[PDB]
Design a protein around this ligand. Structure first.
Ligand SMILES: OC[C@H]1O[C@@H]2O[C@H]3[C@H](O)[C@@H](O)[C@@H](O[C@H]4[C@H](O)[C@@H](O)[C@@H](O[C@H]5[C@H](O)[C@@H](O)[C@@H](O[C@H]6[C@H](O)[C@@H](O)[C@@H](O[C@H]7[C@H](O)[C@@H](O)[C@@H](O[C@H]1[C@H](O)[C@H]2O)O[C@@H]7CO)O[C@@H]6CO)O[C@@H]5CO)O[C@@H]4CO)O[C@@H]3CO
Ligand SMILES: OC[C@H]1O[C@H](O[C@H]2[C@H](O)[C@@H](O)[C@@H](O[C@H]3[C@H](O)[C@@H](O)[C@@H](O[C@H]4[C@H](O)[C@@H](O)[C@@H](O)O[C@@H]4CO)O[C@@H]3CO)O[C@@H]2CO)[C@H](O)[C@@H](O)[C@@H]1O
Length: 477
């Protein structure tokens, strides 16, 4: 039977929120995505007989480890834990600001949150509800069963109930790396990693790659080499992956799907047998641009190009749909692909694994449960591990000689370089690199810092800037 081969690759990442001089985690996002997504996404494999794959960046792994050991000093989480009588005005303000940032997301759909945000002043009981409902809004699928009664209570929480939630949340974090190891050892999914701090490897290897698809971009004078650092990000990531999973990684996810001829050469030289990237890069690079083939870059490394439409349906569209409409839509598009060719297509669905669900009803749990249940009941769909996709023999292949460098942002680098503010960050990094004395310069090469720079004002951007500049300073000492 002619099957459609479906490959999910869920990419998990957080930049380092731990400020190097105080040791404090200045934003809680690793904690909240750990309790909501990083355990629960692979845990779907306990209940659905499909294959799902995951990327974990090493810098994310480091932070999960620190939280699991009780070593993470998370400033926002300490304000949640406190009795409200001990909250500083600054801490109350940060709690309200965090609530307002998240207020319109369906995971914050508690009538008590709307009441609390319409109040001039908050008393102890109201602040206790504000703290506890912020915790509960990030509840993952597993604990939405354990904590179902607290979630339904909706108000009038006690300090002891809040502490119970915190304890269960840390229990989930402590089991998180173990469940990735478990689904890997059981063949239910493959796990990949990325260069250590999620940098833009093509730019570190050769900043002139930005001209390949944006020839008119203005960038600063890269008067220092980042090529050895690019190698170090890959090598350190192989070491961390070996510690956690017991092999050198043969699959990597390039951050931001970013590839170039030189980056593909580096990954191959470091022992990577397969990566994936974006469909826009495929169309920019070749004329006969089917994303359903396994490509071989210069007969040396395997490359899959994700189906951008399917990936972006989950990432951008379906949060606003009901779950049955969305799953029916997704299956219907898969049927069209299946019927459109006489061979067995390989269909990569690759996107962030933790960022879209907060915009779905009930944290995307009705959608994913229905999607996975429906997929496992379609005979003509076979979901694959990355290992299976790499080695599948009954698929079509093609050799590719050259790619036009870019990312999954429209095949180019403009989200990280090319305006005044983003270029200032590269200038700061370039000068720091000339004076660098330790691996904190690698932390500052993470793509996240440049992503947030030079964008229309938002809460907490000042924190990303404080972190970036602190790592740059620490790198020189
Ligand atoms: O409110 C912003 C946005 O919020 C929510 O989106 C989340 C998303 O759920 C997360 O998965 C993550 O997205 C990842 C993607 O998973 C990953 O694929 C990639 O996306 C690239 C796209 O593939 C590429 O097309 C392009 O995206 C463009 C996009 O095509 C433009 O349409 C425009 O998107 C706007 C949306 O159309 C609009 O609906 C809204 O999006 C919501 C979204 O509905 C919600 O689920 O606003 C956006 C922004 O104006 O612009 C984007 C460029 O940003 O490029 C991206 C690569 O950059 O990477 C993203 C993360 O970067 O995070 C988003 C929130 O950022
Ligand atoms: O003000 C705009 C936005 O502010 C808030 O967004 C938050 C997120 O909710 C946080 O989770 C965090 O974002 C992390 C993100 O969770 C993490 O996965 C990683 O994202 C990378 C991603 O791995 C990569 O593939 C590509 O997509 O780029 C991303 C960005 O580099 O790192 C993020 C931090 O850099 O922080 C942001 C900013 O506070 C708010 O919730 C949003 O609704 C809002 O749009």
């Amino acid at each position: 039977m002619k099957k459609l081969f479906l490959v999910f690759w869920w990419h998990m990442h957080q930049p380092l929120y731990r400020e190097p001089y105080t040791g404090e985690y200045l934003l809680p996002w690793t904690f909240f995505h750990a309790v909501k997504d990083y355990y629960d996404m692979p845990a779907y494999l306990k209940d659905f007989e499909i294959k799902l794959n995951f990327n974990l960046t090493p810098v994310l792994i480091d932070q999960i480890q620190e939280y699991a050991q009780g070593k993470a000093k998370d400033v926002f989480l300490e304000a949640i834990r406190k009795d409200p009588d001990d909250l500083e005005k600054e801490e109350v303000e940060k709690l309200i600001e965090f609530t307002k940032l998240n207020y319109e997301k369906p995971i914050y759909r508690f009538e008590r949150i709307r009441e609390l945000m319409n109040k001039e002043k908050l008393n102890r009981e109201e602040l206790l509800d504000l703290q506890t409902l912020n915790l509960l809004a990030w509840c993952g699928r597993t604990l939405r069963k354990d904590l179902k009664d607290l979630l339904n209570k909706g108000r009038n929480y006690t300090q002891e109930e809040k502490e119970y939630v915190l304890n269960k949340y840390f229990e989930i974090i402590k089991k998180t790396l173990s469940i990735y190891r478990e689904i890997k050892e059981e063949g239910k999914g493959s796990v990949s990693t990325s260069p250590y701090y999620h940098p833009l490897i093509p730019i570190l290897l050769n900043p002139n790659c930005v001209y390949e698809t944006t020839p008119n971009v203005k960038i600063p004078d890269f008067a220092v080499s980042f090529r050895e650092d690019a190698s170090k990000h890959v090598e350190l990531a192989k070491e961390k992956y070996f510690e956690i999973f017991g092999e050198h990684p043969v699959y990597m996810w390039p951050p931001q799907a970013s590839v170039s001829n030189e980056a593909l050469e580096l990954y191959y030289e470091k022992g990577i047998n397969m990566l994936a990237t974006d469909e826009v890069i495929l169309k920019n690079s070749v004329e006969r641009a089917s994303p359903y083939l396994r490509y071989y870059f210069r007969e040396l490394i395997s490359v899959f190009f994700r189906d951008k439409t399917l990936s972006d349906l989950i990432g951008f569209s379906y949060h606003a749909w009901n779950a049955e409409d969305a799953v029916r839509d997704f299956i219907g598009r898969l049927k069209k692909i299946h019927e459109s060719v006489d061979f067995q297509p390989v269909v990569f669905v690759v996107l962030d694994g933790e960022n879209c669900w907060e915009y779905y009803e009930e944290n995307g749990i009705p959608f994913l449960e229905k999607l996975y249940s429906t997929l496992e009941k379609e005979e003509w769909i076979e979901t694959l591990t990355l290992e299976e996709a790499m080695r599948k023999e009954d698929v079509k292949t093609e050799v590719i000689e050259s790619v036009k460098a870019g990312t999954w942002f429209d095949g180019n680098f403009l989200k990280w370089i090319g305006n005044k503010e983003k270029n200032e960050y590269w200038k700061i990094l370039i000068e720091a690199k000339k004076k660098a004395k330790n691996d904190y310069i690698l932390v500052a090469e993470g793509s996240d810092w440049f992503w947030w720079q030079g964008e229309e004002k938002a809460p907490f951007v000042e924190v990303f800037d404080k972190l970036f500049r602190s790592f740059v300073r620490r790198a020189q000492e």
